[PDB]
A paper describes a structure:
Here we report the crystal structures of 22 PTP domains, including two tandem-domain RPTP structures and a detailed structural comparison of this protein family.
This pocket has the potential to accommodate pY at the +1 position as in PTP1B or potentially other acidic or phosphorylated residues in positions N-terminal to the substrate pY. The new structural data and analysis presented here suggest that a secondary substrate-binding pocket, similar to that found in PTP1B, is present also in SHP2, BDP1, LYP, SHP1, TCPTP, MEG2, PTPBAS, DEP1, and GLEPP1. PTPs with particularly high enzymatic activity against generic substrates were RPTPσ and PTP subgroups R5, R3, NT1, NT2, NT3, NT4, and NT5. The subgroups NT1, NT2, NT3, and NT5 exhibited a pronounced preference for acidic residues N-terminal to the phosphorylation site.
Numbering used by the authors: 277 to 348, 354 to 500, 508 to 584
């Protein structure tokens, strides 16, 4: 995995000092330094014939080096393998499926043996389309995508997310699998969450379901995470997961390293300076909530 502890990881004490030193503007400037670096890799497949129309945004291709290939038309989906903390291919980061890519998305989920899907947007926000209706919304509804039929087995609404259990039936291989679809509901239309508590609780729900599902699946597959373009909220979610994992195991983390590394796999991960600052602030809010912080 690209996500190894260090070199140069920081304790919470060190992180407090770091962020105090730089303030909001210094952390924004740090994001701009990241953003100014040329990507590590190329984007030729994304932009090729047959594939352009499969991107939600022309300015957000995916890297050639880490793209998820479909085994079947083309092999292309705008989706990237992403490492997690000491874990190869912990995530697939992807855009909100489009009508013409719903079948590709489900083929990816089947081929990659995905058990959990994490959605961090609504279908439309502020009149901006972010995701198509690629799954059956109500219990017992289904959608057929050629040889993959997806059936809704139940929905539960929580205060900050909703959980939908889906059955994917591959009618060619004659096999069925359950996939859990989690939609986070408390990301605001503007800006970043005012508190990270619900997002971190949601992360814990997702982690636990992944663990449970993997334990039951029999002789890990990635978690699919999406937002509009698969870079902003997706990158934030994954980055916080990685940093909290390291903070759990060793009591250290490094946001700069995490985001820099992630961007070599899902290009453009972390879309705004507010998202970058949120990664720092969320971790410090967490530290406080966990009773790890003394103030001046
Ligand atoms: Cl965009
Ligand atoms: Cl759409
Ligand atoms: Cl988004």
């Amino acid at each position: 995995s690209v996500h190894v502890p260090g070199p140069h990881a920081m304790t919470i004490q060190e992180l407090v000092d770091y962020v105090n030193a730089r303030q909001k503007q210094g952390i924004y400037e740090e994001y701009e330094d990241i953003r100014r670096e040329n990507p590590v890799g190329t984007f030729h497949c994304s932009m090729s014939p047959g594939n352009l129309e499969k991107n939600r945004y022309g300015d957000v291709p995916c890297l050639d080096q880490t793209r998820v290939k479909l085994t079947k038309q083309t092999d292309y989906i705008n989706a990237s393998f992403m490492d997690g903390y000491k874990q190869k291919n912990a995530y697939i980061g992807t855009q909100g499926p489009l009508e013409n890519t719903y079948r590709d998305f489900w083929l990816m989920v089947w081929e990659q043996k995905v058990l959990v899907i994490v959605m961090t947007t609504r279908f439309e926000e502020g009149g901006r389309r972010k995701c198509g209706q690629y799954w059956p919304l109500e219990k017992d509804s289904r959608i057929r995508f050629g040889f993959l039929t997806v059936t809704n087995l139940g929905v539960e609404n929580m205060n900050h997310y909703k959980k939908t259990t889906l059955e994917i039936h591959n009618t060619e291989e004659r096999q069925k699998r359950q996939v859990t679809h989690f939609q986070f509901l408390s990301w605001p239309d503007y800006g970043v969450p005012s508190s990270a508590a619900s997002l971190i609780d949601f992360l814990r729900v997702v982690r636990n379901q992944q663990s449970l599902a993997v334990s039951n699946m029999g002789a890990e597959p990635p978690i699919v995470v999406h937002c509009s373009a698969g870079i902003g909220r997706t990158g934030t979610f994954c980055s916080l997961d990685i940093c909290l994992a390291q903070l759990e195991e060793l009591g250290t983390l490094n946001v700069f390293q995490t985001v820099s590394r992630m961007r070599t796999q899902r290009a453009f991960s972390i879309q705004t300076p507010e998202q970058y600052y949120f990664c720092y602030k969320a971790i410090l809010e967490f530290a406080e909530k966990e009773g790890m912080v003394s103030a001046h």
